[PDB]
């Protein structure tokens, strides 16, 4: 078994093993996480 | 060249901000764009003008248009006013000193509102950014901020330091404890957005988008964890349009509290709170009625709850105005009568008085004692002209024309007119001639103060543009009927001479000062120039994306400038009709462009509110001037050219007048401070038997141990490697104290084990050499407690693997 | 949906109040219902820290027992995720321990899909068990330093 993507759509599960539910996330945290993906996608 | 600067701003009595009222009948603070104004309602004159500084047109003056005032609050106790601008900056203003005292900038958006605390030591701010910041006036800093609201704060209420109520655009009413800087309870007032929040003792009232107004009981000392604020009933206000603001007024003699809801529409609703006796008195009849009806006592209780809102409050009266009320505020409270002052978007201040006896008003309808419209244009000034003497400027607006002297900045005479599109002065400034949208031609005599003659059928369609010869004998009309009509003055009356048919409507008509040529602007984007005398086609200008809105002719008359909705100003030579160059001066369309008299230099105004000072020869912008928040509609140049006047949709007319520690030490230094502190605490305890750390607000054991976490592991083995043994003994003493507190050890046990155990490896020879017995006791205590923690985890892991293995094995039997 | 939104908002605010107050047992239930992994991770983490100073505490231990099948599925997906990470497995190991001590071990088996989750928990648990034990072995250095000190 290996940690993968979130089964539930509004949730973010990283390979660290930490699950991040969008509703409880703060807006500042949501912004950086959105930017964090953007770097991941850009090079990919 | 010589720079252009703005001498003054005038024509805007009231801007888009709240009204602030002070008693002396009552003077009123009215916003004037960035400027702030004090008017006296009864007299109607402006007592003074409050300018921040940095006069427009100065080089130091910022390019970007100055932020307009959104909110105003005056403190009676301190006699101080705070101003909230569009950008979000808060400036503290002293009414007596007439200058800003303090500058606060914590909001990136304009402020919804501001409230000085009763003491005056602090102010609470609510901004569209959804940030609520409290600033101490003496400290001049923001003590704390609240972020939880997801949208703009329409209102907030803090009578007591201990608790705050915030109403927000998202529809959530949140109770806040200022001491803890957190929200304790949240409830949705309305599915829509809650615009107005007013609190009167326990009673709290909120207005959403839809008409329903909700009444809330609040008890601070409930201490139930829920229902600090509870809704008792819901009452529908008559106006469908939302209520922007709510306020409460209480009459001292009888203690009755009345409140108004200020709706977006012109209607304003006022409501009265019933006394407890009349309510209990009132409920008794209702009970008696239902007993007569025969309804069940359970149904009787049902009726009481349904109408419970009706019992609490009683409708009082409605106030209606000609124009929509942007802001309104209570002025006077008395048992005999009440008086409320309202400010509308139409730049007028109206003061309304209502007499009431017992339950309901005595007057059938509210009456306004005073209205301030002397210096206010009801509608935007469409066309502006400057007389030949230039002393008097005429401002043409829908339903109102007014002629203002530059020195006074005030109207001399006012004339009733239609939806005028074009305004012009006759020679000598004696008479003013305008063109309506209906197509009727209006001619006013300034001295007479009345119209001389109207020709209703002079033109069927709207008079788009009007221009006159230098002599003034001949008048040319450009308009929507696609025919240009020439009119000759005869003794003074107007008579049609000839009409020239055109394929397209004449948006603009311009005659050269020498009167040799006449220019016509058409919706076909083609500019036709005719000799004025011979009335024959001369040359054409093409290529504009959209029709040219303005045409101007130079003094030398060899030059024609054409401004269009294409957003490019083009410069066309008259001799052959060639374009010398094309400029994209303004992002949005350039409504009007004018030549500076006796100069090839030309002024341009556009919808983006910019006024630019452009030289034709250079083909570049000399200077850029921003002073109007909204689009500047028209630009007029003085005959001398010294000063240029501009009017904008903001109803403000302005004159522009020509004038690091690398890894290792961070463990060393941290270790020295923490160990030195713990030793001092131990030494102090032995007696019974630092400032930086206090700023850190962490225990000495936590602070260093945090520093270990910050250090990267890949450099860690070398950081421990650099350690001198004297610090290693310090490090060993550090751990033993960590070992005392079990929770900290368990939290980061794996890191600790690795740190101790490597450092012993490196210095194992000098550890054994040390002859300190108490050090051995330190080692012994560290060992024993470290064993128990590790054993506890291993026992936990050992149990789980066996149990889970058992569960899998049992399931296998069942399904095998 | 307005009523559901009304109830959901109240649950969020009550959850935040409990966490600030430290009422983990009530916070644990709200986080479980709201499906808040951080608040679910944080309640258990700092609750354990208090326990350091049967498994978590009497009140919370009862709360985990009352969970029906559905929350037991959701809780133990999180423990599987936490177990994978060596910095957060300790929280997972204590939570899974409380489940085995407060539920019928016949019952957890029939709950569909739980073997598969239980399948993923074993390998990481064994890896952690192989760890720590090594730490205990190479912790006996402290004895060798002491006996050399004794000479």
Gap between the Cα atoms of B433 and B424, Å rounded: 5
The two three-digit tokens of residue B513, written as one number: 């000062």
CA-nearest of B68, B13, B65, B55 to B656 is B55
- The alpha carbon of residue A14 is apart from the nearest alpha carbon of chain C, in Å, by 10
Strand residue runs (E) in B172-242: 172-177, 182-188, 196-200, 203-207, 212-218, 229-236
Edge-to-edge strands, sheet with B212-218:
B196-200, B203-207, B212-218, B229-236
Mutation for testing the B interface, residue in C17, C85, C99, C135 having most B CBs under 10 Å: C135
- The alpha carbon of residue C142 is apart from the nearest alpha carbon of chain B, in Å, by 6
Gap between the Cα atoms of B648 and B605, Å rounded: 10
Radius of gyration from C-alpha coordinates of chain B: 39
CA-nearest of B698, B680, B769 to B729 is B769
The answer to whether A33 contacts chain C (CB < 8 Å) is no
The two three-digit tokens of residue C43, written as one number: 């309640």
- Chain C CB contacts of A18 under 8 Å are 37-38, 41, 81, 85, 88
- Chain C CB contacts of B750 under 8 Å are 86, 135
- The alpha carbon of residue A44 is apart from the nearest alpha carbon of chain C, in Å, by 26
Gap between the Cα atoms of B332 and B329, Å rounded: 10
Gap between the Cα atoms of B128 and B531, Å rounded: 58
CA trace torsion B158, C14, A13, A8 (10° rounding):
-110
Chains that touch A (3 or more CB pairs under 8 A): C
Listed by the residue before each break, gaps in chain B with C–N over 2.5 Å are 24, 491, 659, 689
The answer to whether B751 contacts chain C (CB < 8 Å) is no
Gap between the Cα atoms of B263 and B78, Å rounded: 31
Asked if B808 and C119 touch (Cβ cutoff 8 Å), the reply is yes
- Cβ C10–B226 below 8 Å, yes or no? yes
- The alpha carbon of residue C61 is apart from the nearest alpha carbon of chain A, in Å, by 23
- Chain C CB contacts of A14 under 8 Å are none
CA-nearest of B131, B155, B150, B128 to B262 is B155
Q: Which residues contact C29 (CB under 8 A, 6 or more apart)?
A: C63
Of the candidates C52, C94, C145, the beta carbon closest to that of B779 is on C145
Asked if B326 and B345 touch (Cβ cutoff 8 Å), the reply is yes
A–C CB contacts, 8 A cutoff, strictly below:
42
Query: What is residue A5's three-state secondary structure?
Result: coil
| A25 phi and psi angles, rounded to 5 deg | -65, 140
Mutation for testing the C interface, residue in B729, B753, B780, B797 having most C CBs under 10 Å: B797
Asked if B520 and B509 touch (Cβ cutoff 8 Å), the reply is yes
Q: Exposure string (b/e) for B755-783, b if CB count within 10 Å is 16 or more?
A: bbeebbeebeeebbeeeeeebbebbeebb
CA-nearest of C100, C135, C140 to C121 is C100
Paired with B498 in beta bridges are B486
Q: Which residues contact B730 (CB under 8 A, 6 or more apart)?
A: B671, B672, B675
- Cβ C37–A18 below 8 Å, yes or no? yes
SS3 percent helix, strand, coil of chain A, rounded to 5, is 40, 15, 50
Closest alpha carbon within chain C to A21 = C36
Which method was used?
A: cryo-EM
The answer to whether C19 contacts chain A (CB < 8 Å) is no
- Cβ A1–C39 below 8 Å, yes or no? no
Paired with B114 in beta bridges are B125
Paired with B496 in beta bridges are B487
Of the candidates C17, C141, C146, the beta carbon closest to that of B757 is on C141
The answer to whether B172 contacts chain C (CB < 8 Å) is yes
Gap between the Cα atoms of A16 and A39, Å rounded: 18
- The alpha carbon of residue C93 is apart from the nearest alpha carbon of chain B, in Å, by 7
- Those of residues 259-318 in B touching chain C at CB distance below 8 A are none
Asked if B620 and B601 touch (Cβ cutoff 8 Å), the reply is no
Of the candidates C38, C81, C84, the beta carbon closest to that of A24 is on C38
Of the candidates A11, A17, A21, the beta carbon closest to that of C85 is on A17
- Those of residues 125-144 in C touching chain B at CB distance below 8 A are 125-126, 128-129, 132-133, 135-136, 138-139, 141-143
- The alpha carbon of residue C116 is apart from the nearest alpha carbon of chain A, in Å, by 10
Closest alpha carbon within chain C to B768 = C149
- The alpha carbon of residue C122 is apart from the nearest alpha carbon of chain B, in Å, by 6
The answer to whether C101 contacts chain B (CB < 8 Å) is no
Q: Which helix (H) or strand (E) holds B385?
A: strand B381-386
- Cβ C139–B760 below 8 Å, yes or no? no
Q: Distance from CA of residue B384 to its chain's centroid?
A: 29
The answer to whether A17 contacts chain C (CB < 8 Å) is yes
- Chain C CB contacts of A16 under 8 Å are 85
Query: What is residue C132's three-state secondary structure?
Result: helix
CA trace torsion B260, B265, B266, B268 (10° rounding):
-10
Q: What is the DSSP letter of B240?
A: S
- Chain A CB contacts of C12 under 8 Å are 23
SS3 percent helix, strand, coil of chain C, rounded to 5, is 85, 0, 15
Q: Which residues contact B772 (CB under 8 A, 6 or more apart)?
A: none
- Cβ C109–B805 below 8 Å, yes or no? no
CA trace torsion B577, B580, B586, B591 (10° rounding):
-20
Terminal Cα-to-Cα distance of chain A (whole angstroms): 25
- Cβ C149–B806 below 8 Å, yes or no? no
CA-nearest of B63, B58, B70 to B6 is B58
Chains that touch C (3 or more CB pairs under 8 A): A, B
* Residue labelled with tokens 């007024």: B249
CA-nearest of B40, B33, B38 to B17 is B33
The answer to whether B493 contacts chain C (CB < 8 Å) is no
Resolution in A: 4.2
B362, with CB counted inside 10 A (0-12, 13-18, 19+), is exposed
Q: Exposure string (b/e) for B705-717, b if CB count within 10 Å is 16 or more?
A: bebbeebeeeebe
The total of other beta-carbon atoms located within 10 Å of residue C116's CB is: 10
Closest alpha carbon within chain C to A2 = C84
Of the candidates B745, B798, B804, the beta carbon closest to that of C122 is on B804
Gap between the Cα atoms of B663 and B273, Å rounded: 70
Number of H helices, E strands in chain C: 9, 0
Number of H helices, E strands in chain B: 12, 57
- Chain A CB contacts of C80 under 8 Å are 1
- The alpha carbon of residue B801 is apart from the nearest alpha carbon of chain C, in Å, by 6
């Amino acid at each position: 078994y290996n940690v993968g993507k979130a089964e539930k759509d509004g949730e973010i599960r990283l390979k660290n093993g930490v699950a991040m539910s969008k509703e409880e996330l703060t807006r500042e945290d949501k912004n950086r996480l959105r930017r964090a993906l953007k770097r991941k996608r850009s090079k990919a | 060249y010589q720079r252009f600067e703005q001498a003054a701003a005038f024509g805007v009595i009231a801007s888009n901000a709240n009204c602030v009222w002070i008693p002396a009948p009552g003077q009123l603070i009215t916003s004037a764009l960035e400027d702030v104004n004090i008017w006296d309602i009864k007299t109607g004159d402006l007592v003074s003008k409050l300018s921040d500084g940095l006069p427009p047109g100065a080089s130091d003056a910022r390019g970007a248009k100055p932020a307009e005032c959104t909110y105003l609050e005056a403190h009676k106790d301190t006699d101080l006013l705070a101003v909230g601008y569009a950008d979000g900056v808060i400036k503290v203003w002293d009414l007596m000193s007439k200058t800003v005292l303090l500058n606060f900038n914590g909001h990136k958006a304009a402020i919804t509102l501001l409230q000085f605390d009763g003491t005056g030591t602090r102010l609470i701010s609510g901004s569209k950014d959804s940030n609520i910041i409290v600033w101490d006036l003496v400290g001049e800093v923001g003590l704390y901020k609240l972020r939880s609201h997801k949208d703009s704060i329409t209102g907030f209420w803090c009578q007591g330091e201990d608790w705050l109520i915030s109403t927000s655009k998202d529809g959530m009413i949140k109770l806040w404890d200022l001491k803890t800087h957190q929200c304790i309870e949240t409830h949705i007032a309305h599915t829509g957005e809650c615009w107005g929040l007013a609190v009167k003792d326990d009673l709290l009232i909120t207005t959403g988008t839809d008409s329903q107004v909700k009444i809330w009981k609040l008890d601070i000392e409930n201490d139930k964890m829920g229902g600090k604020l509870t809704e008792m009933g819901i009452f529908e206000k008559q106006s469908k349009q939302r209520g922007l603001k709510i306020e409460f007024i209480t009459n001292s003699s009888d203690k009755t509290s009345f409140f108004y809801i200020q709706n977006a529409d012109k209607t304003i609703e006022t409501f009265r709170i019933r006394k407890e006796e009349e309510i209990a008195r009132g409920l008794k009849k209702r009970e008696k009625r239902l007993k007569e009806k025969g309804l069940t006592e359970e149904e009787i209780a049902k009726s009481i709850k349904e109408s419970y809102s009706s019992f609490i409050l009683h409708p009082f009266q409605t106030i209606r105005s000609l124009y929509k009320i942007k802001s309104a505020s209570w002025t006077t409270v008395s048992s005999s009568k009440l008086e409320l002052v309202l400010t509308t978007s139409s730049n007028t201040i109206e003061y309304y008085s209502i007499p009431y006896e017992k339950r309901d008003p005595t007057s059938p309808a509210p009456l306004k004692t005073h209205t301030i419209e002397l210096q206010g244009q009801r509608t935007d000034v469409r066309s502006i002209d400057i007389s030949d003497d230039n002393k008097l400027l005429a401002t043409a607006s829908n339903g109102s024309l007014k002629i203002w002297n530059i020195k006074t900045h005030k109207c001399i005479r006012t004339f009733e007119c239609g939806y005028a599109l074009t305004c012009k002065f006759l020679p000598g400034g004696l008479l003013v001639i305008l063109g309506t949208r209906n197509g009727e031609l209006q001619l006013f005599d300034l001295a007479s103060s009345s119209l001389l003659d109207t020709i209703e059928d002079a033109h069927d369609a709207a008079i788009w543009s009007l221009d006159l010869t230098s002599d003034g004998k001949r008048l040319v009309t450009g308009s929507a009927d696609k025919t240009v009509k020439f009119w000759d003055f005869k003794v003074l009356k107007l008579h049609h001479d000839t009409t020239l048919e055109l394929t397209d409507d004449i948006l603009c008509v311009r005659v050269s000062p020498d009167d040799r040529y006449l220019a016509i602007s058409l919706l076909d984007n083609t500019v036709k120039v005719f000799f004025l005398d011979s009335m024959k086609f001369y040359l054409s200008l093409y290529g504009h994306k959209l029709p040219v809105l303005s045409i101007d002719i130079s003094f030398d008359s060899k030059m024609i400038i054409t401004s269009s909705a294409d957003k490019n100003i083009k410069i066309w030579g008259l001799d052959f009709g060639d374009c010398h160059k094309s400029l994209f001066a303004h992002q949005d369309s350039i409504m009007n462009v004018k030549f500076l008299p006796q100069s090839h230099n030309f002024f341009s105004c556009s919808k983006d509110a910019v006024v630019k000072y452009w030289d034709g020869e250079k083909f570049e912008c000399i200077q850029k001037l921003y002073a109007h928040q909204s689009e500047v509609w028209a630009l007029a140049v003085a005959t001398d050219g010294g000063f240029v006047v501009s009017s904008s949709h903001d109803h403000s007319i302005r004159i522009w007048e020509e004038t690091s520690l690398k890894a290792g030490e961070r463990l060393m230094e941290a270790l020295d401070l923490g160990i030195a502190e713990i030793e001092g605490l131990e030494a102090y305890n032995r007696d019974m038997k630092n400032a930086v750390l206090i700023a850190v607000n962490k225990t000495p054991e936590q602070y260093i141990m945090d520093t270990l976490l910050r250090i990267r592991m890949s450099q860690l083995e070398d950081a421990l490697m650099v350690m001198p043994f004297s610090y290693v003994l310090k490090f060993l003493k550090f751990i033993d104290t960590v070992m005392q507190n079990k929770t900290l050890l368990h939290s980061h046990l794996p890191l600790i084990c690795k740190n101790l155990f490597f450092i012993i490896k490196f210095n194992h020879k000098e550890l054994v050499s040390q002859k300190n017995e108490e050090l051995k006791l330190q080692i012994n205590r560290v060992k024993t407690e470290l064993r128990s923690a590790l054993k506890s985890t291993e026992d936990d892991l050992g149990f789980n693997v066996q149990g889970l293995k058992f569960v899998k094995q049992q399931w296998n039997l069942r399904h095998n | 949906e307005q009523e559901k939104a009304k109830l959901q908002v109240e649950q969020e605010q009550s959850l935040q109040n409990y966490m600030s107050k430290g009422d983990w047992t009530n916070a644990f239930l709200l986080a479980m219902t709201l499906d808040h992994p951080m608040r679910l991770f944080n309640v258990l983490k700092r609750a354990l820290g208090e326990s350091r100073s049967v498994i978590f505490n009497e009140e919370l231990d009862q709360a985990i027992s009352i969970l029906n099948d559905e929350q037991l599925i959701l809780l133990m997906k999180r423990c599987r995720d936490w177990n994978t990470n060596a910095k957060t497995h300790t929280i997972a190991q204590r939570t899974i321990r409380c489940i085995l001590m407060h539920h019928n071990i016949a019952k957890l088996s029939e709950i569909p899909g739980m073997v598969k989750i239980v399948d993923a928990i074993i390998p990481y648990t064994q890896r952690h068990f192989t760890r720590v034990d090594n730490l205990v072995e190479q912790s006996y250095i402290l004895d060798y330093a002491l006996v050399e000190m004794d000479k």
